Amino acid sequence: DRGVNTFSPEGRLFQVEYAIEAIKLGSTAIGIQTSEGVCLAVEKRITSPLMEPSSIEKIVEIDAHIGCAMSGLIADAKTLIDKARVETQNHWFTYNETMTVESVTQAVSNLALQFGEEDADPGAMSRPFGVALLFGGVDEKGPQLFHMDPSGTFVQCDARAIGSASEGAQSSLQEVYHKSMTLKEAIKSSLIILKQVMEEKLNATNIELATVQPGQNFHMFTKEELEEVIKDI
Amino acid sequence: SYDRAITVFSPDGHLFQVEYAQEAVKKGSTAVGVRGRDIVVLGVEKKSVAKLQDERTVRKICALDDNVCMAFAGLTADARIVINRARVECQSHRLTVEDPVTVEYITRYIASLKQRYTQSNGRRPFGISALIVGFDFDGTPRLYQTDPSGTYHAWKANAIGRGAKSVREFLEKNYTDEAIETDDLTIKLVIKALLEVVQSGGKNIELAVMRRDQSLKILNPEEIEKYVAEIE
Amino acid sequence: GYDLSASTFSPDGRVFQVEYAMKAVENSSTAIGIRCKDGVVFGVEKLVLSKLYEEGSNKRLFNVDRHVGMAVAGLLADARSLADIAREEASNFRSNFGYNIPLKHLADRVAMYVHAYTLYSAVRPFGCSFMLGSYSVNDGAQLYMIDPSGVSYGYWGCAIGKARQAAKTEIEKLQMKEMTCRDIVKEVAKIIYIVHDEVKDKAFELELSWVGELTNGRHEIVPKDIREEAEKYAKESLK
Amino acid sequence: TQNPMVTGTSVLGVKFEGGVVIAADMLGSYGSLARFRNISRIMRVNNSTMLGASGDYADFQYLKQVLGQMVIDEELLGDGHSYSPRAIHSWLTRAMYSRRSKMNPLWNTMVIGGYADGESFLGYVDMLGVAYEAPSLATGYGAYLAQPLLREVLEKQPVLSQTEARDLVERCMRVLYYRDARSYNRFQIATVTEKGVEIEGPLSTETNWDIAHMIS
Amino acid sequence: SRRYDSRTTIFSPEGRLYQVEYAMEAIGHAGTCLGILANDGVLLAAERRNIHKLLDEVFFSEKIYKLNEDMACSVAGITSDANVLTNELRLIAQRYLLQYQEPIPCEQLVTALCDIKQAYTQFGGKRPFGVSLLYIGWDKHYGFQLYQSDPSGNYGGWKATCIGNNSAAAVSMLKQDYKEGEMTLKSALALAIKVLNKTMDVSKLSAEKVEIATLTRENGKTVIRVLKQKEVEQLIKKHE
Amino acid sequence: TTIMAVEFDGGVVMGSDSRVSAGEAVVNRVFDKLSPLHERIYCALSGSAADAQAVADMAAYQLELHGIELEEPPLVLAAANVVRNISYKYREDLSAHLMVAGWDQREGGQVYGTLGGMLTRQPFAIGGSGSTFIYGYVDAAYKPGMSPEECRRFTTDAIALAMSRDGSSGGVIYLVTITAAGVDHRVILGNELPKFYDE
Amino acid sequence: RFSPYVFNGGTILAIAGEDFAIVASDTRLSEGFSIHTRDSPKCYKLTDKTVIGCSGFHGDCLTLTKIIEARLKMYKHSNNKAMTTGAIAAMLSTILYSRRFFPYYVYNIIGGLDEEGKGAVYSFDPVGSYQRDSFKAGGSASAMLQPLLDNQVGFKNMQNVEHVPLSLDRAMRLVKDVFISAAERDVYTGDALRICIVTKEGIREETVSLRKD
Amino acid sequence: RGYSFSLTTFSPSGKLVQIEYALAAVAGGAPSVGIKAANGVVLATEKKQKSILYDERSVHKVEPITKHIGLVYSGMGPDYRVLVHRARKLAQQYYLVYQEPIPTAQLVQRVASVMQEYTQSGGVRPFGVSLLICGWNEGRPYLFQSDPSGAYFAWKATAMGKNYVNGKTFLEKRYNEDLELEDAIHTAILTLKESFEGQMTEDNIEVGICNEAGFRRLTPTEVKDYLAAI
Amino acid sequence: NQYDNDVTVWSPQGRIHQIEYAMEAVKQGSATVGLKSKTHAVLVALKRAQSELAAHQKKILHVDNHIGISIAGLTADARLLCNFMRQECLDSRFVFDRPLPVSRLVSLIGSKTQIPTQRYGRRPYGVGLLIAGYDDMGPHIFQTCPSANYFDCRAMSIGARSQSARTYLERHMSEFMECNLNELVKHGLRALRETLPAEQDLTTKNVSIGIVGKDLEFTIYDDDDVSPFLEGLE
């Protein structure tokens, strides 16, 4: 057995490779960036009708202008979400302004490779976050969607698919996306791809959807709105 | 101090310690709950009848507050730890907010705690799944399931412990708005559920009951046995 | 094997980690010093690994204090760390005791420092040797050579690196007890040009230094004119 | 160091074309007593910097050992980067200030002068963190007696030849001898220029007492 | 370094803490110990392993320790660990008596300790205590009580139980021979000497191979008493 | 308290009175104010006698470790740098004053002054509460280049003067002459103190 | 008793127009009954849009400005943009308050251009407690310059006077004439004037002479 | 920094194998013997003395812990020095706190605790010594045996080290409750004499006695006298 | 197999396998090339794009007014070590009131990355940096490596396939002291394009240029910003 901080013969940490394999088992989520704002839709993958559909929340709020989709070990991403929340609010307190998306995804990105087993002044994190986040939001620079992964690399992306069927779905993103796209077109397109990828038959329950527009705050589409958008199928 | 990384990924992305803890839950004494109109019932299977046994100190259905109680299954000691931490945290919440905790608050708390011990130095994951049932201050019924992985959910009625596959199949089949129209149909739902898995219809689980804005109500095994003959 | 950490004697009683680290010093490039009547001189077979590097990259002659020089070898980062530890040592001694630290006590302290890492599984040995030079009116010239084991020996002539044996056979050809610095510099030059296997690992630099009477005890790198006359004569002695 | 045990008197500082010159008498007092009469209160930090200090003397020696330790640690690197007088000034400002922030104040009133790159710097740092440049400085009562002479002459001539500066310092120190009770006719004059720091001393001050026979 | 870690705080491929169950093997090899809960008192009966040699018997008993005014505990297995646990329980109950000015109930005490044994069983990587404990103590809430705790930190109240060697045969004999709520103190003595007679395979039972201490109530005070040897010979002879 | 040191060619001479008074009644009328820090390095105590003693002992410890570790007698400059560091680091807590004096191969006799945590070599470094009464005498009678007997009779005279005037000083006058040969501890009884103008 | 605060005097001033923000201060650095230097300008260029004044205990002026600028490069590193005047104001409120129990005894007045190119001046106190005004004086001579700036800039207690917008020149003559009105009377004001004008074009610096006596 | 996990883990059979092995180490130690009389306690232990070069009076196995307590061990020497210094520390804490000579049952409880702490702490092996602590107070003799596992037994008379089984069987037939102190010493010295292999002398067997007057070692003269008549 | 699990295990050949495997990380990074002239220190980075829709990850990081870096390898390590560098420079401009000399900076980084390379259970920083910095001694281009060793280079190319760029840079290093800014950046872009596959091309997107010199504080040029310097490229 080896440590958590071991580099393989190829030059990647083991735990980041095995962790980025662990994200491959999560439910596929997708969001797309447009000049009108950015949308976010994620498959819930309900396991049983006894479940409450509103329980699985894979698209949560980080502040009035930053919606954080995720995929993978949903338990791990709680520390990330609360980290980002405390961050942007402390930023608001100190500097009296909303916090940019790049600042947030960078700050929360600082926690990935903060893991070890010998420094450990507290009982600090003993493995990389098995979470792949997709911080979406708008700032003075406008709409932006920053991917993030367990390896801590936060990259700006126009539209990105993460999770189980992220491979094919991403091919659909490069297939369909174009810069001049309108936001409702974004919603329709992403729901089309999810319908392509999901195992179960799609409905307004086993998914969610949120967007953040230049004047609109973060918002999660309720059941009726989701149905109204799925009427196009 | 012991700072080895016990819980580490494996060559599939799996956290083997988490799958193993969930193995320990899958051998736990089967528990079930349901969410009714004004009542919330939990049933904990039998566990260890053992005629010399004492009933009171071997139950799985502890109180977390006036409006929040919980079953579980698995390493009972660990669940005693989580129950204690949740109790202290409920009271600290009444100290810092003056408002009794929503079920969402305490459940999301304990889910955070289990998540931390899944991911820290020298600490094994808890082997407990907790079906915390309770009433928000508005009085709505609440069922939250929390497993060793730390992911929690609202639930209509979900079963944990050994054989939770067949019992969960049961609530999938029999949970209907006719089923929870009244109290006794609800409780005969729970016991009607475990009876597929209980050791002959029983005592051999006794249960627990909570009414809206009423403290946790337990059952003695007589009234359990009335329902026993009523379903058998 | 039995060799997985320093805190494990073999069945024969050899802490294999220290011996291995010595095998790390021996793969590096040879450096030599010679204590003489009036000071100490250092040469450095500093192989330059590509034409891109600046003239002066990867210097292996440091300044742990103004009256003490330091020539290293082997894994070089560890050499730098010994530079920081030694510099902290002399600084601590000037703040405590108010004068230049005697080099002997400095190789005691540093030698205990290197030795502090050959007892635990929690850390590994420094894989680097090095030489210290000093001159003072009170004690003359002195040259100590710490190795990965932490042992400190005083030498009249030293050599550490890959060609240590040939450099020793070259150093024994000298009456270094009866030479001065300005003549020692040439001979150290001839040593480095001789011991250097040229056809394998070509393209090194010569990086010299002394400390003694002519520098008033202040350790300073060699003047470029003296280095170049030195290389000129040594190369001429190759012929 | 809440209380001063062995203090010095006023230090004088004055620029001039191509270098800075300061003086500080070699006296070290203990109360009204003139206990130590041959202590030097002007340090050479390197070829381009030289420092002075009134007030507590022990803390001055702490700043000698620490400060010379810094410049020696920096000379060790041999990387060609040496602290200009502005760096040393700013550093003493920060150390003095922080010590103030802990209410453990170094009871010095230092006056750092230097000459790097043909620009005569002349700093000031007192115990509380006050700092600034100036063409003419004088700590202690020197800011009362010699300071008006120096700002008077520099007002008459903001650019001074070196010897004119040296006479100006000598004459200011004459005033300090006549009128400053904690003074003494034994002072060093430090000159920092292109060539380097030169510390002349112990010097002395001719004194006139013709007025002593005027009272009648 | 990681070669050396035994990893005593990890689950198995089937969800079974190897160190806790191995410890259960150790206590499984310990001397049997059983007490009975009755109406007029409680008795503990433990097979001694100080059997017989040039030992001195300087103490009053072997496996029975006194915990407060009102409780008593019996250990089984690792003797040293039993010492550490006993000292810790005394410290707990006396801290409760400092901080509340009343005796500590048995349930609170057992929970306070079992949180400790669980704590070692979870993190820190130390080996768990291989020491099972049977407690007896009176409290003004719930009356006479019997608490069995084991290395895993789990505990339960019992009316009569036996831990250690041949614990299965002992609990079996209790199931066949315990009259719930109708066992008297003397009936408890007789039954206990019954079970210990049948289980202890060393063969003719002596007064030297066991000890029994009983706890009852007397004049608003609790009495914790060990049986002198004459009473033990009397009760074994009566058993014949 | 009146301790005094002098520098002459072969070594030094550390005179010191022998009274330690508690307020207005004396506690000890014989007290050697010269505790050795090494074989040839004495420190003349003063001020808080307890504090001065602790300072002398700690300084003797460090000077002995540093002494053996180099395997050569520690230079007096070393000693006055350690006593200077320990007197400066605690200057708010120690009312001590230690005119540390001695000999060493590299420099010969030395007398470093360390009042308040400072370090200044001096020809004659007098200290103590009675030292404020003999500045006149020592300034009027000190001529550089003193033979040893001149130093001994000199400091005996000076401390005699301080003893006659000062209340914080009385008793006998200890004298030690530190040179390359070794230390020569001597005592001046009250019947031998050279008498001065008494009225 | 060691006293850790000394009043090194020197007054600052700040005004906000429709498109600019002047900041001005005397450079007499007094103490007790002397003049340390007749040159120590109490305005410190923070960014291209923000000119911060500091009066009072000169040491804490130095330390406080140094800490501010360090925070500006921290912000610029973690956010890829210089702090506006709003952020600098709030951040200097938490800096000045995080030492609530041993204050920075430095009357700041941050004047500059917000992101709308409009004037803004945030006058502070030694323990935080900021606000946005249209004009402000601070330091030694605040009480002699404040009312006159109410009069010729706030137009208070006037009748039949058109509240014309504050033009850059008339703000200039107000600044210089009021500092002369202080130099006549305030002991701590004089020896120079450091007027820094802020516009979108950058920061242009202007100095003025005053009474030396 | 050091290893933090216990090195002694329950073997799958549940018996702590490191304490089995440590007990095997004490079982190989030099033989020791202790017997409790009616008025005191004897301690006599065999000197496994190599070459005559040894200054036998240089170090002793029977060290006093206070004026009334002794110690003999069997196995690893330096470990024993650890437990001796620890015991002296404990008895001194007790004497400061309560102002009374520490009762031997107490001291054996604490030192037993310290011997236990290392069967469980991080990265330390258990001790390799089995103490015999003899003590007198309340007008009564005490003799305890502590083992590597930390448990201590109260004994009439005991034996440990090499051949401790034949030693104990030798004591079962030769210890009687009314044995006065000197005849006790005779019985112990005979006990060692059964398997000494080397012709005991007053140099190579130590003898300790604890009675009402306190504990002490018998000088090799006196021990020579007791080595008479055998 | 039994020697490659730890940083603190010397092989029988006297090599720390974890450190070498750490350098394999920077060898896999996206190629970044620096170099310098008599007056300027230029950086040139190929910002990898994971997906077509994804944006090329940033490889350049502002460190202070006169010092900039170019990471290649484990990115989060790069931002950690970058935060350290920034804290160093801010502390120097705080205390000493002058910009930190670059060589001292790379010395601090050297001692920093050396620590885990020798203590058990730590891991070497898998981030290989180029640092450009101008100070009184002229422009600088330091290379740092997972082995904690730092270099002082005329021009160095790190990243995947960097050997080609170092080959070209040997072909033309002798000209670099005299080149002006634009010609210099042309050299950098050419050598960096020597690394990529033949068909793929430098564009305004996948290139970043951070220049710093005498009369110029450090400045980073992004996708549209490299247009001016992004031309010709024979």
Side-chain angles (χ1 to χ4, degrees), chain H residues 89-101:
Chain H
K89 182 68 176 177
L90 289 176
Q92 295 305 322
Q93 292 181 358
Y94 185 83
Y95 186 77
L96 293 175
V97 178
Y98 298 101
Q99 296 299 311
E100 186 179 1

Side-chain angles (χ1 to χ4, degrees), chain B residues 129-136 138-145:
Chain B
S129 297
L131 299 176
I132 290 171
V133 304
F135 291 160
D136 293 333
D138 60 357
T140 301
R142 297 292 185 184
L143 180 63
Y144 286 160
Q145 178 177 1

Side-chain angles (χ1 to χ4, degrees), chain C residues 120-145:
Chain C
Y120 296 94
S121 67
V123 298
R124 64 176 173 84
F126 286 104
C128 72
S129 297
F130 57 91
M131 296 184 287
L132 295 174
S134 96
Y135 184 78
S136 66
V137 178
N138 298 115
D139 292 332
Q142 294 178 357
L143 184 66
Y144 290 163
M145 185 274 287

Side-chain angles (χ1 to χ4, degrees), chain A residues 94-95 97 100 102-103 140, chain G residues 71 75 78-81 87 90:
Chain A
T94 303
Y95 295 155
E97 71 181 3
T100 64
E102 183 177 1
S103 298
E140 70 274 17
Chain G
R71 297 294 297 272
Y75 185 86
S78 68
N79 294 317
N80 293 318
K81 66 182 181 181

Side-chain angles (χ1 to χ4, degrees), chain C residues 71-146:
Chain C
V72 299
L75 183 61
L76 196 285
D78 295 333
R80 290 182 179 94
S81 180
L82 271 296
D84 291 331
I85 300 299
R87 293 178 183 176
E88 182 178 1
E89 184 65 26
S91 178
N92 288 319
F93 185 80
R94 184 176 297 112
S95 295
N96 290 318
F97 292 96
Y99 64 93
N100 293 320
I101 189 167
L103 177 62
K104 186 177 185 294
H105 185 74
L106 182 61
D108 285 331
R109 302 293 294 162
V110 173
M112 297 300 101
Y113 184 77
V114 175
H115 179 272
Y117 290 170
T118 61
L119 295 176
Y120 296 94
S121 67
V123 298
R124 64 176 173 84
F126 286 104
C128 72
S129 297
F130 57 91
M131 296 184 287
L132 295 174
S134 96
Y135 184 78
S136 66
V137 178
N138 298 115
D139 292 332
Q142 294 178 357
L143 184 66
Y144 290 163
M145 185 274 287
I146 294 90

Side-chain angles (χ1 to χ4, degrees), chain G residues 194-199 201-209:
Chain G
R194 179 61 56 83
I195 292 172
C196 295
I197 297 91
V198 177
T199 61
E201 291 80 0
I203 298 169
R204 183 179 63 85
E205 180 179 1
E206 183 177 0
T207 187
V208 175
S209 178

